[PDB]
Write a protein that holds these residues in place. Structure first.
Motif, PDB file in Angstrom:
ATOM      1  N   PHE A   1      36.277  44.896  34.335  1.00  0.00           N
ATOM      2  CA  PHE A   1      34.822  44.342  34.230  1.00  0.00           C
ATOM      3  C   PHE A   1      34.296  45.568  35.475  1.00  0.00           C
ATOM      4  N   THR A   2      34.830  44.842  36.545  1.00  0.00           N
ATOM      5  CA  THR A   2      33.553  45.540  37.811  1.00  0.00           C
ATOM      6  C   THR A   2      34.203  47.346  37.830  1.00  0.00           C
ATOM      7  N   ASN A   3      35.029  47.559  37.393  1.00  0.00           N
ATOM      8  CA  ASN A   3      34.951  49.501  36.759  1.00  0.00           C
ATOM      9  C   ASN A   3      34.004  49.574  35.489  1.00  0.00           C
TER      10      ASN A   3
ATOM     11  N   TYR B   1      31.273  48.346  34.778  1.00  0.00           N
ATOM     12  CA  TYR B   1      30.018  47.858  35.390  1.00  0.00           C
ATOM     13  C   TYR B   1      29.307  49.157  36.023  1.00  0.00           C
ATOM     14  N   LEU B   2      31.129  49.550  37.295  1.00  0.00           N
ATOM     15  CA  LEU B   2      30.299  50.540  38.059  1.00  0.00           C
ATOM     16  C   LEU B   2      30.362  52.245  36.861  1.00  0.00           C
TER      17      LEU B   2
ATOM     18  N   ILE C   1      39.525  40.762  35.954  1.00  0.00           N
ATOM     19  CA  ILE C   1      37.722  41.538  36.960  1.00  0.00           C
ATOM     20  C   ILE C   1      37.989  43.110  37.204  1.00  0.00           C
ATOM     21  N   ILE C   2      39.458  43.583  37.530  1.00  0.00           N
ATOM     22  CA  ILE C   2      39.603  44.697  37.527  1.00  0.00           C
ATOM     23  C   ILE C   2      38.907  46.103  36.335  1.00  0.00           C
TER      24      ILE C   2
END
Ligand code: CDL
Ligand code: CDL
Ligand code: CDL
Ligand code: CDL
Lengths: 384, 100, 89, 49
Positions: free
Chosen positions: C82-84, C86-87, C79-80
């Motif tokens: 994928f979120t980074n 995306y950012l 999750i971390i």
């Protein structure tokens, strides 16, 4: 030529229906999970293969006593010169906890004689990252270090020196030979290793096994866990390593098992050898030794249907056919189910699919009345 | 040319041969699917595919269902019974009315 | 103390006939508490001679939080990541 | 006198002599393990038990 005996089997009693105080086996069995006696009748040689996890004081004392009383012609210790120097400079230590206090100093013996070139630096970075990942997946505590030699090796070497018998150092788990072998294989990558190690336990069984294994390691200490590591647990650990990293397992276990077998079989004085090796090389070394010396246990052929009681099935079928014929003749009717005992897999109880067994191809078929009460006599005799 | 037999229900007429076929197909499927576990274990009629505590694995049993479907040309209802031993596979195969 | 009904009803000697011959109906011997199943699936197949009892047990119920936390670390790191990702993209 | 020390010693003796805790009646195991496995405490711990 090739003797394809089972080497790494961890599944114990898959024919028993164990559980609830009826276990599949005893895993504690100390002093026997560790020492194995092998013989070479062609040359009259005897080998005492001691597989150590380098964590138990009791096993260290047993190995020391064995070397003292057996008086072998050669001792083969799986350490190197640097570790032996560090350990011989350490004295007045007689329990494994005190030696575990020096774990970093003894781990300094893991010295890699690599170059400073760009390729060697890249390899060092990759290898250290892979080692970090594989130690994360291994997850062993301080008191259980199967790859850092301890009191058992030190006692074996000291007792060999007291008797003035030659000592052959086979190198640690990761030595120059295995380091070059890992250099040959380019499959080292920390990220791919993480991904493959979090996919190793692909079914529940492995997961469950994993849990309980490490669960014991968390409850009982390293000393109490070294004693309760039998052949099945060792084979499970080598297979877990294979699932984590098949290439590095092939390099580190199989190839090193072959190298240790070579050293123990040919590069040794002989006629009496005491070989203190790591725990998980014992299966491979023993298998190779038995295959080479033909000292395998006699084969007991396993018929796949040997444990199947076909007579029980046929007698049940015959009994139920006779009972159906008898009851149908008594009641002046026909059987309703033709299934000996009613179970819900066909749903014939509430659906329209019968289990009636009446098969024939024409009006002249002799087998037309098989399964029907007309097949039996008034004495309930099977024919006519 | 060997002419196939006219009489139907030959699977139920040879319990030993049916058990041999079940053992062969199950062994091949288990060694292919889970080589690290079943490549050394002989599979006989009394062999079960559960844990030492009687807990069953759904993935292994569904693999065995697929193996039995391909071997005997049947459609095993996975929601009605789970094959956790060779005896259960034998019961399922011999209960089906169209195995071949 | 019984777990299976076929063992419970096979040979019962605490039947009302005998207990009336002694006429002492203790409370602890209520039939409401005598038998109770195992709460684990247990169905019947046809064995070689008779019915065979097969138990379907899928997952344990005594899991503690540490197992859940350790089995969740890869998911949290995914999750971390994928979120980074995306950012950054 | 129901002396506390002597009564505690007698209580322990009564509990152990009741016969309920005979080790032959028990198959000691590691209860936490998912698979049924025997008691794997060290040899000296087993002797102390
Ligand atoms: C060579 C040069 C490098 C030396 C590295 C240190 C060292 O000597 O480590 C020794 C260490 C001994 O381990 P052990 O005997 O289990 O002892 C465990 C103790 O807890 C003792 O473990 P430890 O933590 O003391 O040692 C492991 C080592 C491992 O850590 C490292 O090597 C750290 C390297 C970091 C480099 C940078 C990475 C950056 C990117 C990360 C992503 O950790 C450290 O050196 C300290 C922690 C890291 C500090 C730096 C962090 C940055 O490893 C080896 O000897 C090599 C093992 C290779 C793997 C084989 C098995 C794989 C798993 C298979 C399944 C389980 C099998 C069980 C079998 C049981 C029956 C036999
Ligand atoms: C209509 C369409 C139906 C089909 C849709 C597609 C499939 C969806 C379900 C996928 C799946 O694998 O479900 C199986 C899954 C059960 O897992 P399993 O793979 O059978 O367990 C294998 C072993 O038995 C495991 O047994 P064990 O006791 O050895 O292991 C402990 C086990 C104990 O068993 C359970 O907890 C199962 C509970 C159900 O718990 C776990 O393994 C799960 C927790 C792991 C830690 C957390 C993982 C990350 C969480 C997310 C990130 C952090 C936030 O079932 C469910 O998720 C729902 C079951 C029904 C619930 C009640 C409904 C009324
Ligand atoms: C995090 C997210 C990711 C999680 C990943 C892991 C997921 C699986 C975990 C393990 C599941 C499992 O099988 O557990 C064993 C557990 C064993 O239970 P059991 O021994 O059979 O008990 C029977 C009833 O389930 C007994 O049920 P019950 O009537 O006792 O309770 C109802 C049950 C219903 O749960 C479900 O249906 C599953 C959800 O649980 C809840 O409703 C739990 C939430 C409410 C908790 C109320 C108490 C605490 C209140 C205060 C909390 C705040 C902090 C206080 C701080 C105080 C001051 C510091 O399995 C089940 O309960 C079966 C369903 C499993 C989940 C299916 C979905
Ligand atoms: C509810 C959540 C369901 C879900 O998403 O399940 C994922 C599902 C888990 O499947 P499974 O039925 O649990 O079988 C895999 C085993 O459980 C695998 O054995 P396990 O239970 O030991 O593994 C934990 C389990 C978790 O999932 C469950 O428990 C779900 C169960 C349902 O599965 C995974 O985490 C596998 C997914 C891939 C993880 C890759 C992680 C890479 C980064 C790791 C960082 C670690 C920390 C830093 C280390 C740095 C170096 C020291 O995996 C995937 O769908 C993988 C998709 C492809 C990769 C993304």
């Amino acid at each position: 030529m090739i003797s394809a005996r089972a080497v790494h089997r961890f599944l114990r009693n898959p024919n028993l229906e164990t559980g609830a105080a009826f276990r599949a086996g005893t895993r504690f069995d100390p002093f026997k999970n560790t020492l194995t006696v092998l013989k070479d009748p062609q040359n009259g040689r005897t080998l005492y293969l001691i597989g150590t996890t380098n964590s138990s004081t009791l096993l260290a004392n047993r190995t020391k006593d064995l070397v003292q009383k057996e008086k072998p012609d050669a001792v083969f210790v799986q350490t190197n010169k640097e570790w032996w120097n560090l350990a011989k400079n350490i004295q007045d230590v007689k329990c494994q906890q005190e030696l575990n206090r020096y774990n970093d100093l003894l781990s300094q013996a893991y010295t890699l004689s690599l170059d400073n070139t760009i390729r060697n630096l890249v390899f060092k970075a990759k290898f250290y990252s892979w080692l970090f990942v594989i130690n994360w997946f291994k997850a062993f505590p301080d008191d259980f270090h199967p790859f850092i030699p301890g009191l058992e090796m030190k006692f074996a070497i000291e007792e060999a020196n007291k008797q003035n018998i030659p000592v052959v150092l086979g190198g640690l788990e990761v030595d120059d030979v295995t380091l070059s072998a890992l250099k040959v294989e380019p499959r080292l990558d920390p990220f791919s290793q993480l991904y493959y190690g979090y996919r190793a336990l692909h079914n529940s069984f492995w997961r469950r096994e994993h849990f309980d294994n490490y669960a014991t390691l968390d409850v009982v200490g390293g000393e109490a866990y070294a004693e309760s590591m039998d052949r099945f647990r060792t084979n499970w650990f080598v297979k877990y390593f294979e699932k984590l990293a098949p290439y590095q397992k092939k390099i580190i276990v199989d190839q090193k098992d072959l190298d240790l077998f070579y050293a123990l079989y040919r590069d040794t004085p002989g006629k009496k050898i005491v070989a203190v090796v790591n725990q998980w090389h014992v299966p491979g070394i023993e298998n190779h030794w038995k295959s080479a010396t033909n000292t395998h246990e006699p084969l007991k052929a396993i018929n796949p249907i040997g444990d199947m009681d076909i007579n029980k099935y046929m007698e049940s079928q015959l009994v139920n056919d006779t009972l159906r014929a008898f009851v149908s003749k008594v009641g002046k009717t026909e059987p309703a189910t033709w299934k000996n005992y009613s179970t819900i897999y066909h749903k014939d109880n509430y659906e329209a699919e019968r289990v009636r067994h009446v098969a024939f191809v024409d009006h002249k078929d002799p087998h037309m009345y098989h399964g029907l009460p007309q097949d039996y006599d008034d004495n309930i005799k099977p024919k006519h | 040319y060997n002419f196939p037999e006219y009489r139907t229900g030959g699977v139920q007429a040879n319990p030993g041969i049916t058990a041999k076929r079940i053992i062969k197909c199950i062994g091949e499927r288990l060694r292919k699917y889970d080589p690290a576990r079943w490549e050394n274990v002989p599979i006989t009629f009394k062999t079960h595919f559960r844990d030492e505590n009687g807990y069953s694995d759904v993935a292994t049993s569904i693999q065995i269902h697929d193996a039995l479907e391909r071997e005997f040309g049947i459609d095993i209802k996975d929601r009605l019974a789970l094959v956790t031993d060779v005896e259960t596979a034998f019961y399922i195969v011999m209960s089906h009315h169209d195995p071949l | 103390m019984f777990r299976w009904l076929f063992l419970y009803w096979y040979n019962s000697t605490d039947t009302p006939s005998a207990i009336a011959k002694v006429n002492l109906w203790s409370y602890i011997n209520l039939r409401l508490f005598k038998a109770r199943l195992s709460s684990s699936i247990a169905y019947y197949i046809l064995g070689l001679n008779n019915l065979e009892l097969k138990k379907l047990k899928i997952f344990y119920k005594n899991t503690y939080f540490d197992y859940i936390y350790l089995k969740s670390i890869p998911c949290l790191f995914l999750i971390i990541f994928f979120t980074n990702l995306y950012l950054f993209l | 006198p129901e002396d506390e020390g002597i009564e505690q010693q007698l209580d322990q003796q009564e509990v152990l002599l009741s016969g309920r805790y005979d080790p032959k009646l028990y198959d000691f195991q590691e209860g936490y393990t998912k698979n049924p496995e025997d008691d794997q405490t060290s040899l000296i711990e087993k002797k102390a038990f």
